[PDB]
Amino acid sequence: GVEIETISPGDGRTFPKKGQTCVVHYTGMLQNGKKFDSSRDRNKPFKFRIGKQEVIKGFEEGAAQMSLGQRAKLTCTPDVAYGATGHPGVIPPNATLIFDVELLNLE
Template sequence: MLKLLVPRATPQRSFSTTRKLMSDLNIEILSPGNGSDYPKSGDVLTVHYTGTLTNGKKFDSSLDRGKPFQFRIGQGMVIQGWDQGFAKLSLGEKARLTVPPLMAYGNRGFPGLIPPMSTLVFDVELLAINDLKA
């Protein structure tokens, strides 16, 4: 079940919608996509992302490497928060995914980068679904 919350408009942002899933994954839409093309399990997604801890410390970014990241959605290739979060985004959409620890790296964290039980924040953009580009 998806709960859609529309926050008050802020001067810095012309569009923002927040979706909170029952799993405590939070999806804030920063820029809408095409609204018609959504990923399904098994699709290959091409994305850009920047990952930070809740204190703002960046731990990874495809933008810093200058190359988008690709993965097959729904196949366990990425953290659960990404599999569930990207499934709710349409082609071209930009969003902020706030991923709770148990949908990210949980008790183990990611040594040297992500402490155990960390909530992660990802600014993401869905660039392509299979060969369909935004």
């Protein structure tokens, strides 16, 4: 229920199903373009599992709306994010965690 805009169209129909290893290569910056994560940097394809409540709810909602080869600007909401608490050290309270993802493979 968050703003999701497709950057690069994949195919759309590849819906990510629960119980799949969603291999992505993503990054993400703050409101002012200040980077706070880049899986491209550490050369790590970030893998996660849907429904298991692994990553926060903004990423968990935007992961379902994508497909294979689809880049997307997951412009998340601070209420859906860590909130008025934030991540203690990395992310201040009330941020817009603008992500930039790319799906690679499923399981």
